[PDB]
Amino acid sequence: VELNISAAASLKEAMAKIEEEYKKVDSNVKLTVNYGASGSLQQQIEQGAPCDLFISAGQKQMKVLDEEKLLVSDTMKDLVKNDLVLISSADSSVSGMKDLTTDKVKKIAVGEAESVPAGKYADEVLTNLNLKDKLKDKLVFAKDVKEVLAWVQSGNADVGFVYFSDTVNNDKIKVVEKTDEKTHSPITYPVSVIKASKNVDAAKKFEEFLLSESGQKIFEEFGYKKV
Amino acid sequence: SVELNISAAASLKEAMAKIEEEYKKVDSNVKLTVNYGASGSLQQQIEQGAPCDLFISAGQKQMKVLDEEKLLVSDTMKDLVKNDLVLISSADSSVSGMKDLTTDKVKKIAVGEAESVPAGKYADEVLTNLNLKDKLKDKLVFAKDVKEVLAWVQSGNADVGFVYFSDTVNNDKIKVVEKTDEKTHSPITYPVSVIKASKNVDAAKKFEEFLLSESGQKIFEEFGYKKVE
Amino acid sequence: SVELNISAAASLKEAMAKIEEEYKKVDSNVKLTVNYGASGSLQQQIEQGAPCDLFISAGQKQMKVLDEEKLLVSDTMKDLVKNDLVLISSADSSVSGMKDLTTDKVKKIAVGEAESVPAGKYADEVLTNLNLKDKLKDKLVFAKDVKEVLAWVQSGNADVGFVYFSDTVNNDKIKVVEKTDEKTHSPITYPVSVIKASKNVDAAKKFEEFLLSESGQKIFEEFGYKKVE
Amino acid sequence: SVELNISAAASLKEAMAKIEEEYKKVDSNVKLTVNYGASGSLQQQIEQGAPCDLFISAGQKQMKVLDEEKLLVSDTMKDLVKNDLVLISSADSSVSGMKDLTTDKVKKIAVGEAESVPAGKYADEVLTNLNLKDKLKDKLVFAKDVKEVLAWVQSGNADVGFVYFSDTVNNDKIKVVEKTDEKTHSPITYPVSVIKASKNVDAAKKFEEFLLSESGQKIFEEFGYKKV
């Protein structure tokens, strides 16, 4: 059977392992995974694109679809979530957020608050901790998380804010701390079977694998967390 | 034999053909398929999951939207090439400078709409920064594309016009009068990036390196494009 | 940036220098470090685990062992270039061709020692297959290497000689009378392969395809080598 | 912070890459540097007094010379993994068993060369022991290595081929039709051992047991290898 999956492109590295495993888990089904923006994938599903399963970055796109009656609602669940973490150079004395206030911390790298997802949550966290106005003389702004990583690696920034899934298998940086879930809005990836599919039966089975222990640990292998 | 889907701004077409044939000689194992279009429509397709391996846009705008949606291999984001905004005229025109603009040697100045035409946006910035825009309002006629600005400068509907230097190549009918000072406007950049969803990242990265290399650079320069600062 | 270690037969040294400067023009991101030696010993180092990325050999024997021991990326095994066994004389000699070997016009035929010198081993094959080896025994003189063969022929000590075409380039003092038919001897080929233990397999595969490309092949042909089939 | 020098046959490279990142989880402060070479050349390096902790050989020909020459810790020489000789065809090639070899369904059988390719040597022992080698001569075509065997079967040039099972993982363009009886060919084994001259005898053994442990013996299993 052929299942069509649309997904946020940030899951591509984790999704390679899932397909590969699922071949062993079920030889019968081959999966064609499609990657794009959750907004545009939302459009294609609204316009009747033959997708069997949808995993978006965030509740927003999925919420519009549920109301628009295009999802099998009982299949609408949270797949994984992400952690905003504080990183630094591997060889520095940063141990916590209280250091950002200190002389020890001169430069803090964050994504652009408006058009970088990690920067939005980073801004949201510093705002709620009342540190945002305290660190304006330290906050430098990057175009993406790669640049936040690179500035922290090369020493251009003392510490940075980034997803934990952006840190896996990288010896050059160290995850100093993890941000409290209660300090920002949930960074979640929902998954749902599409109603217009002709493989609801098979699509349900694949989603169950994704939500199963065998699938969740694969996602943990790439820095994602369960909900 | 890997097949690479390259999407590029329609402006790059003539130069992209030479790039294509020259990469055949350096790598026989890569098959390049290049479809062109406006940067916004090409950006649109990548977001829908269209299988494109490499993207070359005119403007930085379409890139940081894609990058924000995490559809790019971020470390492959580079400035490929640059352009110059040039003042052009009829080949026989007595105009010889930006100084001639505020004199009565010039009746009409053709520019693109500053809101919907990039060459118009840069022209605006130049006229604004040079403090010439108010004095020249009685001369400014507005076009819907760079192809219209040129067509007005030839056929004498406008004495003078603002276009990219790359539009001026292979036209003996129009002559470029003066190159706009780089200091007076936003960088006219054609950035390139490998698409994250690509199934041929390494092959794409390799091809991008060809564009970013002395041979690719020298090819773009044959069609009026310029070295990145 | 990537640093590739290439080990090649010491005969390729002159060609690999033009390969380096030319690859740099199409890929700024790769630094090549080329080590030269005897193919058999180069094989031993790879067998010991010496960090090599690409290997270019003089013969097929050493590739077979390496592949048997699984030290190669098998699907990258290819024939890069091949050489030709040619008949040479002095520039002013006026020897016409292979037919002139049997005539009284030539008295001394210079060849490499049939076991110590590969060009001699292939000369022996040609003369054997053409049934000329016995008739010519009174004419055959044996050199320690092709450099001595060329010297004898240049000085007139030998009327003609057998040598690789690549040993003739950049020398007007001698002239290539005729190239031996390829049907008459075992293929004189130089195989290339990416090394399995390499930490830059893809960068190595990409550099290998430059070698197998039209421009890369044409570089080896500047140095007397020839395209494979 | 201990560095371990590991000399291993180049067969295990892809498997060891998953061993390294996992032992990194099990032990944070050990640096694994894996040297890949021919087992005969790694043997020579060990014989010169060169410094290695653990040796993984392809076959026991080398690990016999060293064990005699008192260069090993004898109590650490065990068989790490074995290999299986399997029959393959393309995916859904309608070939079902070893029976089809003698039918018209199969007209071309790809094996490695008998005296150049290890998998070609064992497939030879099998067909010989199965009294099939003489009957099937008009079907037997010989490849330069297992990659080419696979290539012929994927493409359809050969209807059927013999390779190791570890050569067939993560490939959906062929089908492992049948495993060869282990009794019909010489044992295909990889021994492991700690060299006497290691700076860290104990550290290597805590790595050895990890490879011998279920945790390692299942990383190998997903790379096609088998228990001993």
Side-chain angles (χ1 to χ4, degrees), chain A residues 9-10 12 34-38 40-41 43-44 114-117 143-146 163 166, chain B residues 44 46-50 64 67-71 73-75 77 195-199 201:
Chain A
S10 54
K12 182 189 173 191
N34 199 24
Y35 300 90
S38 294
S40 302
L41 298 169
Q43 268 205 27
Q44 301 302 126
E114 283 158 303
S115 53
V116 184
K143 66 188 185 175
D144 50 43
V145 299
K146 285 291 199 59
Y163 290 160
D166 294 322
Chain B
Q44 208 149 330
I46 298 165
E47 289 167 329
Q48 293 161 16
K64 42 181 164 186
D67 190 26
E68 111 102 26
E69 282 143 356
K70 291 218 157 297
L71 305 178
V73 189
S74 292
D75 65 54
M77 301 178 69
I195 306 303
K196 144 88 57 197
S198 179
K199 298 172 163 192
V201 170

Side-chain angles (χ1 to χ4, degrees), chain A residues 156-171:
Chain A
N156 294 281
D158 301 326
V159 302
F161 283 96
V162 83
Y163 290 160
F164 182 77
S165 65
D166 294 322
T167 56
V168 292
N169 298 272
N170 192 281
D171 47 318

